[PDB]
Amino acid sequence: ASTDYWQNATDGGGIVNAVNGSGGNYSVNWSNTGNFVVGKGWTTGSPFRTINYNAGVWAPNGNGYLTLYGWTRSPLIQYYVVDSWGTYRPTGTYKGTVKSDGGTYDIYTTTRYNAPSIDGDRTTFTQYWSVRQSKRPTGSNATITFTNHVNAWKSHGMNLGSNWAYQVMATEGYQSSGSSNVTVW
């Protein structure tokens, strides 16, 4: 059940220094970026997975997300379970709330157009989100019971695709600086 996948993608703006550490550990130091997504997890996501992580350092200076991050195909959907962030809390079209792992999360949809996706092509895809209503404490072991999110999403007509691609616990940044260190299993 150990992680088997390393996500390290940057648009190339500014500095994004990602280290593929031991096992499920990684760290990122970044400055004057653009957009990047770095994380560890699994090549083939599951709706049934129980994700454990410990963010030993969560230190964005500006806009960054600490989030479950993954894709499906059939249909093409990028999804989030956002536990913490920096200066900016992400939002979208409000659907409702879900309680999971000691937190209340807002459920959102968004859409991207003319946008990079896993297929390597610029296209259009829907995004599903759970975003915690307040920041989750970091530095101790934390669980994301993903089934709870999948089920709440289903109740709001947000159905994931049949073809599961990667599924990681990520640091995502936007035009910011910061540091993170996260362990995933």
Please state the domain count of the chain: 1
In a domain, 37, yes or no: no
48: containing domain: 44-178
CB-based contact 35:45 (threshold 8 Å)? no
Instruction: Determine the Cα–Cα distance for residues 83 and 184; give it in Å rounded to an integer.
Output: 14
Tokens at residue 66, please?
Answer: 């600490």
| Residue 160 exposed, middle or buried by CB count within 10 Å (0-12, 13-18, 19+) | buried
What is the distance between the terminal CA atoms of the chain, rounded to a whole angstrom?
Answer: 7
In a domain, 157, yes or no: yes
In a domain, 11, yes or no: no
Question: Determination technique for this PDB entry?
Answer: X-ray
Reported resolution, Å: 1.3
| Residue 32 exposed, middle or buried by CB count within 10 Å (0-12, 13-18, 19+) | exposed
In a domain, 152, yes or no: yes
Q: Cis bond leading into 75, ω under 30°? A: yes
CB-based contact 133:105 (threshold 8 Å)? yes
33 closest CA partner among 171, 170, 172, 173: 173
Order of strands, sheet of 142-145, starting from the edge strand that comes earlier in the sequence: 15-20, 25-31, 177-184, 50-61, 142-145
CATH number of the structural domain spanning residue 129: 2.60.120.180
In a domain, 54, yes or no: yes
In a domain, 53, yes or no: yes
In a domain, 14, yes or no: no
In a domain, 150, yes or no: yes
